[PDB]
Amino acid sequence: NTPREVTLHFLRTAGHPLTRWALQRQPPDPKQLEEEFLKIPSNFVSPEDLDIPGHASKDRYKTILPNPQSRVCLGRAQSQEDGDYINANYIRGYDGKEKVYIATQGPMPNTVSDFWEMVWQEEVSLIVMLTQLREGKEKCVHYWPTEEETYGPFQIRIQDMKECPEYTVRQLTIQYQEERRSVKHILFSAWPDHQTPESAGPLLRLVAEVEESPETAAHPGPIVVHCSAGIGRTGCFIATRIGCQQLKARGEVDILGIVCQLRLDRGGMIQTAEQYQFLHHTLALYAGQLPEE
Incomplete structure (x- = not known):
């Protein structure tokens, strides 16, 4: 087979299912996880x-x-410019279910309208943003309003906003022509680029916040997950969610297989061996929190 076909065969067939017990009590060691990643x-x-x-x-x-x-x-x-292009991919979810997520980069000022068009057209009701809030100049533009802004044909208005530990929840309305839809926006602020959070607790609470979010569109649409480049932290978040789902439903998790499936959907999902290790940590914590009960 070609290098391309060798790549695809690995991504379709690699796997390391771990029972809940193995994950919690006899996990692969860090050297093993790094070599695996x-x-x-x-x-x-x-x-x-x-x-x-x-x-x-x-x-x-x-x-x-x-x-x-x-x-x-x-x-x-949009009538301002042609093209159907946005740097975003559909991502399969638990058991390979289609279009559960979209992983995308942080919008730039010239792609903000594109971003909201995607949100509109894909019947998105939830956006998960992963960033590290630091002081000073920002790598990525704020594509959401303080109160109300128009982006191309889309009017966005903040309905309410609240602070939780390590994340802000915004409730938005998006208006296109005579139509309005509600969109929930979660901004998780403690994830530095190319790194992990200090603790897995807040990340698991974010996953819980996601689980508890209602679908608000006429049809179910993807959850948009983004971060600056749209691959490292997006990959970590989505893998965490799917991992939690495996652990809850099956009492086991195949983290290797999860990450392989993400890579079939978008190149480079999960950037570092440290992030891959932290994923195992996060899922072990989740396993300890599962109801007894």
């Missing part, structure tokens, strides 16, 4: 494998691109 192909696409004229101006990083087979394609809601 480093074996997983990135599945990045190269600029040459994309034939989408004009996409480069919509990418935050030229080497981090949406795999074409799962990319989110925009409709024709």
